[PDB]
Every structure is written in structure tokens, then in C-alpha cells.
Symmetry: C2
Subunit: 30 residues, 2 copies
């Protein structure tokens, strides 16, 4: 079922952006 | 197309994991 899969993608993809910038923030401090 | 959507979710989990590992590494770092 497409929309849920489609939904899960848009879901994962946003967590990815938030983790990515976290690291980035962490690298400075360290 | 479904199998495409399916593969995208799977590829995104692998990125996510790598990411959490890193953020962890970076955490100890503090």
C-alpha cells in the first residue's frame, strides 16, 4: 500500500535531516 | 513501483543507523 510506504519515506527522510545536523553541531563542539 | 518504494525505505534505515552510530561516537567525545 503506497501512501503508507510513501509516508514512511517522508518520515525517515526528515529524521535523517535532523540527525545529520546533529552530528554537524556535535563536530564543532568536538 | 512498490518494490521501489520498498527498497527506498530499506536504504533509508541503513543511513539512519550509520547516523545514530556516529552521533553516539560524537557523544562520548564530549
Amino acid at each position: 500500500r503506497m501512501k503508507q510506504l510513501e509516508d514512511k519515506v517522508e518520515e525517515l527522510l526528515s529524521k535523517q535531516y535532523h540527525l545529520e545536523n546533529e552530528v554537524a553541531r556535535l563536530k564543532k563542539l568536538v
